[model samples]
Target: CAYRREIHHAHVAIRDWLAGDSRADALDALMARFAEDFSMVTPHGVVLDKTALGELFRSKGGTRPGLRIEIDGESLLASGVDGATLAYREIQSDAAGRSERLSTVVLHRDDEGRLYWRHLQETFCG
Candidate 1:
């Protein structure tokens, strides 16, 4: 369940970043967990590459005060040589309100034996 731990880690990274509690280097370190060719399908059905995703997050620093992210209902969908697919529910809450998404993430282990996010697709949920 390494990816499960990583999944939560990534969310905490964002939460801390948005709250302005983490340094730029810390955020960049979290970003490094993503593969170079990482791609994501957002809840709005928009596609984003790694660079685009990084830019989007970088521009949003400290945008959401008191923001908190929660993950639940995680399940392993599949696994292959050096790869795994996981599905989970992600919930975000802040002063505004709460929102949720069901996300499917594909991960791959590199030659360095590190798990990196390869692709992620998310659909909005109540």
Candidate 2:
């Protein structure tokens, strides 16, 4: 139950960040839950570190007004003292009517820590 709860909490944090609502705050909160050396792979096959990821977010113009993200479902690959992999679909929309589907694998730390996005692979499901 705790594992599920943790996963849910992490998901909430991510959604908030992507939605452009309290994005900086959400990212700060997530950083506290996840490891500093966290890494993620974009669907375009680009591997990025935490700093790089932050840059990527900045490049995307950070969070915009009216941004939103919806998670379809998640599958917990494993959970233990090491980490966990949460696979899910992230549906996102912007104020300009632009939308995209992102398939992500979130790696959460063992301890009740910050939420770092381990893998953020996007997909075009249109």
Candidate 3:
């Protein structure tokens, strides 16, 4: 599906950003490659934007300090186009250097021919 492809591209962008695989450039390359108006609702019910998302990653402070997200069981809904309710596993490091995992659902769409994330709602599991 087209939506799956978009999500996959987004995953690659995020992974590349976290891995620090690129040099002599800001994170804008990955940000721009994905979406501008990205929004994410954390498992704690906290909402985040693109800038906030960057801060979250920076706060981790590790070699690969970013959320290790895995998307699966994506099913397209009736948006008249390629759209899905995506299930994700979000992994991040806490202040105590402990790993935590949270489950999330993100609604994705290609807005005006550009890939954009619509809504993301997360819930903590264990």
TM-score of each: 0.93, 0.65, 0.60
Candidate 2: Cα lDDT at 37: 69
Worst 10 residues of 3 by lDDT: 94-103
Clashes of each: 0, 6, 0
Candidate 3 per-residue lDDT over residues 1-126, each given as its tens digit: 666676666665665556554444546555554346678887678989888877776553335744354556555544445455555554544233434444444444565655557666767655
| TM-score of model number 3 | 0.60
- Candidate 1 runs further than 4 Å off: none
Q: How high is the lDDT of residue 79 in model 2? A: 62
Q: How does residue 14 of candidate 1 score in lDDT?
A: 83
Global CA lDDT computed for model 2: 0.60
* Top model number, TM-score: 1
RMSD of each: 1.3, 3.5, 4.3
When sorted by lDDT, best at the front, the candidate numbers are 1, 2, 3
lDDT of 2 by residue, 1-126 (tens): 444465557656655665555555556566565457677666567778878776665444445666665666666766666556655666667676755555656565545553444555666666
Pairs with steric clashes in candidate 3: none
